[PDB]
Amino acid sequence: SHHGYQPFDMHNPFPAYKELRQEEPVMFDERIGYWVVTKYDDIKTTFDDWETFSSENAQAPVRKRGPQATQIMTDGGFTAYSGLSARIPPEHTRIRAIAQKAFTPRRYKALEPDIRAMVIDRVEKMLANDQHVGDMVSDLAYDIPTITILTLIGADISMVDTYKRWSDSRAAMTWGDLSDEEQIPHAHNLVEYWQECQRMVADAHAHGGDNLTADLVRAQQEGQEITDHEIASLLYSLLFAGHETTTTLISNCFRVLLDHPEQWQAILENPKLIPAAVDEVLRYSGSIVGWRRKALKDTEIGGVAIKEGDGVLLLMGSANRDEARFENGEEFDISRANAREHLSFGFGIHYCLGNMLAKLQAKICLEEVTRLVPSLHLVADKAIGFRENLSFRVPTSVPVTWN
Template identity: 75%
Template sequence: MATPSAPAAEAVAAGCPVDHGHHGYSPFDMTDPFAAYAELRRDEPVMYDERIGYWVVTRWADVRAVFEDWETFSSENAQQPVRERGPEATRIMQEGGFTAYSGLSARTPPEHTRIRAIAQRAFTPRRYKALEPAIRENTRAALDRMLASPDGTGDFLSDIAFDIPTITILTLLGVDPAMVPTYKKWSDSRAAMTWGDLDDEQQIPHAHNLVDYWQECQRLVVEAHRAGGDNLIADLVGAQDGGAEITDHEIASLCYSLLFAGHETTTTLIANSIRVLLGHRESWEAIVADPSRIPSAIDEVLRYSGSIVAWRRKALKDTEIGGVAIPEGAGILLVMGSANRDENVFTHPEEFDIDRVDARNHMSFGYGIHYCLGNMLAKLQDRIVLEETIARVPSLRLADDAQIGFRENLSFRVPTSVPVTWED
């Protein structure tokens, strides 16, 4: 295990208590964390975990209160590597000119307010409407390829969910969709370097990928200045030319963020929607019989099995969370995956119920000023994929021998595969 990042040392120096049992919680193990979340909510809803150097917050009311109070709990550490970069990875990134910063999620007001207001101009209903036919066409083509399998089996993650959101976000940003494999590789490296538990040697190939990723984002901004175009980056450059207060570096940083967040979590949402709905056959049959129930089913998937289960904040002063004293400078890990199953908010929270009236109270898109800018696009794509899939292959089911694992990560709960089969 690599050396914990600076927040750990700061918290220990501040005299933070150390829990000795952790209540079954394992920070990077995403296999099935929900029993441990329940134990934390019951026994120690605000727990300092010395293994990662963060206070772990698991109750819905506490998570929301921290998200809401951006003046006390800064987002500045949201994109900070969980583990310090090793000397070789640091050298590679410095010499490669890597200066990428968060698009929005780690920025704070007034900078965050200024950039978000400009970025929102590009996330218009017109753009979503224009993308919908292509999303349907791409989904149908991907289904055709999967269903052509001679043995009647496939992997919904790699066959469908992997490409659809990536093609969508690349199209939105004016990037050649043929670069899907390259951007997926870069995104995997970003997730591993920022939220993974890598030693110094493991970081090296990812550092090279992040340099390439950042250089491409800068190139896209230069190209938008040169050639314009009908895409989001060109819109931002046009806004800049029209007097909007946004720099090329900030546009490239937005690109750096969107080319990750714009597909990675949506790929997982689509994969989880299929995985969970097929795992609850009565729910699958319900949306097959009545596709109008798909939007509520998506909200319940987001609550029950969200793509992002934890996010980070930093205390800017001595404060409290849920009655527990938190020192200035402490790192906070907000476990939305636990908050989404809080018994004080959701009736029978461990049950998956697409008719649940309180599902939209989930916090899988965050809360407050950093609420996910692309939430509507993510849900649009998931809805289209579900609509097209139930129309084309209502007999879809999980493979009988499906053994679905999850990648190790502090924040993202990503299945490694979703094996499926179907009847002719």
């Protein structure tokens, strides 16, 4: 049964990863139509070889878009595909160089005090609950990265819930195992999402502003080569990638660390261990466990022949456990010296644009929650569910209690 691999089952895929690494490290899975690759060396090499393995299918729906969803999105004027992750050179190179300028550790330093204050506010609100029960997703991880990226882009922060609906739909439409009928509500949401991206660009043309959208329009007006459609597509990209995965990371920091109370206790006694803890959470529980490529010519992965046009699914979640790179890879250890060799941000020309902003927010959340709620405790591992998806491993809640 494909060595136990269930492509959309996100609850605990690592036993199957381990059997694949040992038994069939490059496996053709006809259930999804991809070569499934699970070893670190093969995955890093494939990421590096962008001339042979293009990202152009990284935003293609796993399940073909059905007739009604297709009509909805055509009639709704949905013309988006990918701001960056599935573009290829030369367009990718040009657009990434322009987008990169806004995401530097210096441009976050002015944001850290605001993020930290917001974290403390959310923590205090949670601790006021009557039952002394909380949920690290809805009570913290849900809002913090979303407000951060909305503020950076120039969207009104009153639409957090709308953007979560739109992000849920993008994740489900593109990587979910959806029937034609199940695609319909998501198709309507994607139409709305794209129209708002277009509106924000038009608004920046008309009224300027102090935000990323207005800065990108200013770059265009000052001679830089980027179109309105490419700017709107960058919003489409950042208003999804800029919070969906970070919410998951924050959620997983508490899920995994509270599952390992000796290491929770370690960061209580020494907050300086928190950055390395976040590194090991990214290795052990990355927000994305698999990412796609397309072979541009007949080639090989791990000595297995792959035909031009074949799709490839790189399971970074498996790479990050590979014993050839990570000794005792199935164990969570915040002192792991080479945890930052993980592939949860990818590798190469498409390497995550916002990885430092994600880690910053995870650090701040862990710093303030450990300070204000040292007695935080999980209700139960068996109380955490994961939505089905090919690529994104999202815990739906993280129920917690405290003294």
